[PDB]
Inverse folding.
């Protein structure tokens, strides 16, 4: 199990993905997602120039030692580029270990805790009516849970995000959003009733007392979660929200370390932690985050956008299958070309994922095919207030 | 004036440096340090592929807007690669602003608060005796303050004892014993005080190797020697790690060279768990961000102690000396001399005299880069070491 080769693959079958592959002397290989949307080449360089050369000759079986070696050894700790590189290595090594054990990853983690993995779909429209049409469409596809978003009247742009080479510039009004958003949830409940799980993503745009107000306003509609209410580098930002509303709260897709959320969890300021495998240091780190969360009744809600590759999604479905405190798994379907580049054995049926049974995380990469889709630069948008203030997107 | 061009320069005049240069439509230019030791090319790519293209055509004068645009706009916030890229842009833009104002940077910041900037030098040796020899040598050069490190008997390799840490292509592997270090370290400080007396400022870098209660013990043990600071006692991603140390010793504490965000140290500062904040301009988001960190620190009597190793370029050092000259709550400035080749690649107007830095008077931060000279020294990979315990446990270096 000594590592004989390690290298990145960069491909764009609909959007950019970076993948790390590790091959052992025996021939067993593993892959890990290394995709960091809008900053992809920073991780590619971090891996190619600084991590990959140190992997050669290491015992691929020493997952924990390698994690600590890269985490502590980098000297400069944490961060999106850093932890994504570490996650890619970690995910490839767990893939290798599961293959060596002859087991699908969920078995190696402690076995199945559930028979299937509940997902939610994105439902978006310009008007509230447009959004309701999308909800109906997804309910018919078997989704038990939908995230709803609609345009704000008076505002040209509200939350494939990486649509432009350079960042697109959106304009935002908090006050108009706060008055309009509760109407969307009222309308969803009027048309679809109470059994549907309804989620909403605030996408970082509020202050705490504004989020508190929104949380209260939407209590009658019993949302599954209100996500990313406020920027949370200062974790105390959640406190006012939690003290003022019983609407459940989700946060953390932009986090990369347990140290970004330890206090959020221990103070019981959130209900769902959203940090995913690719950005949160892989299986090794996320097991620890999920276990900490479990002590405080917090459940997992992994970020699952198109900009995490099928490698992440497969591993996430395995993790979701084992973890006791599973909440929900986001599903944004990849393109057919992306699915072809990353063959996999996870299945989607009746609104749920089912883990694969192949040894490993069940995902591979077709390198020859990946090479036919060259990288194309694409950046995430930015958001400005009406006066031009650079805001949170 | 809009940005016409922006690009990185990577050079290795003794060790690796990455620099960002921004050029305006009028031809005026500014530079910023982008060097992240042992991970240099991650920052180069972050800048080259993702930041530089977004700078073209921007108003160079909009420093704050650019900082927020890069920080918030990245979506993934904070981190060493991220914040070093942002710092490089920020430093180059302040360089340009000061040149436009026709003033040295310290004047732009609020003017001078001091007539000179106290430094400390690194004194190191295998034995305590070897270290003392180095102290004597630096005292002779005019240093008022010294950091002292020496070998631990029974341990082959320890931090700060040979010094250029990134001295191998792949990470060197060192071995460590906490218990041997804890019993030996106080003997070094006792010896320094015996030979050199009480007026000298004496610093020591623990370099992340202790647990909180071990650092508490060390702090107490070294109280009689009145250290200027005991630095980086424990890894501090969990900021509460400092609490037991602070509750058990009056030895002053310094932390933060591995930090990149005010959010890495807000609680350390507000709870009064440290005396000096060490996060430097290059890794801490530049002048824009570090002004904010220093100001928060000032409310709690915390002083600046910018990390100043060889792996921050003369661009950072010059900007740091300007910052140090203005900031009210200045503590000390680390000085690790750069190589001749490095100083030639980065011509500068800061000066070192009688143990102190003096800020330049040229408009800008006073540092430039000679691109033709830089081109003579190609990048050469070098990684920081890792540290293992005697049983093989991957530890903190
Ligand atoms: Cl980073
Ligand atoms: Mg979201
Ligand atoms: Mg109360
Ligand atoms: Mg240090
Ligand atoms: Mg007490």
């Amino acid at each position: 199990l000594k590592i004989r080769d390690a290298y990145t693959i960069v491909t764009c079958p609909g959007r950019n993905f970076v993948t790390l592959k590790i091959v052992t002397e025996s021939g067993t290989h593993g892959i890990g997602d290394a995709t960091l949307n809008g900053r992809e080449m920073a991780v590619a360089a971090y891996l190619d120039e600084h991590v990959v050369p140190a992997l050669i000759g290491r015992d691929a079986g020493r997952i924990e030692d390698t994690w600590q070696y890269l985490y502590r050894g980098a000297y400069w700790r944490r961060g999106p580029v850093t932890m994504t590189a570490i996650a890619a290595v970690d995910m490839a090594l767990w893939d290798i270990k599961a293959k060596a054990a002859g087991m699908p990853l969920y078995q190696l983690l402690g076995g199945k805790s559930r028979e299937r993995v509940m997902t939610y779909a994105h439902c978006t429209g310009q008007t509230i009516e447009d959004c309701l049409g999308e909800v109906a469409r997804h309910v018919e596809l078997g989704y038990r849970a939908v995230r709803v978003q609609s345009g704000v009247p008076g505002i040209e742009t509200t939350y494939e995000p990486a649509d432009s080479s350079l960042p697109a510039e959106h304009v935002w009004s908090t006050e108009k959003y706060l008055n309009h958003a509760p109407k969307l949830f009222a309308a969803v409940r009027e048309r679809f009733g109470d059994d549907l799980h309804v989620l909403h993503d605030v996408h970082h745009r509020l202050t705490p007392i504004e989020a508190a107000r929104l949380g209260k306003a939407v209590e009658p509609y019993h949302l599954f979660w209100l996500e990313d209410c406020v920027p949370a580098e200062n974790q105390e930002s959640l406190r006012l929200i939690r003290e003022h509303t019983t609407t459940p709260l989700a946060i953390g897709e932009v986090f990369n370390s347990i140290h970004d959320c330890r206090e959020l969890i221990q103070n019981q300021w959130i209900d769902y932690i959203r940090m995913p495998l690719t950005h949160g240091g892989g299986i090794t780190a996320m097991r620890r985050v999920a276990d900490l969360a479990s002590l405080y009744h917090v459940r997992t809600g992994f970020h699952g956008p198109t900009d995490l590759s099928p490698v992440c999604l497969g591993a996430a479905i395995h993790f979701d299958t084992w973890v006791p405190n599973f909440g929900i798994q986001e599903h944004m379907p990849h393109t057919d070309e992306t699915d072809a580049v990353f063959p996999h054995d996870y299945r989607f049926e009746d609104g749920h994922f089912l883990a694969g049974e192949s040894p490993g995380h069940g995902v591979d990469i077709d390198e020859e095919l990946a090479a036919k889709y060259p990288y194309e630069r694409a950046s995430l948008p930015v958001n400005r207030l009406e006066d031009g203030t650079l805001w949170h997107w």
Observations:
- The first helix of chain B runs from residue 40 to 55.
- The pocket of magnesium ion (ligand 4) is lined by residues B 205, 231-232, 257 (CB under 6 Å).
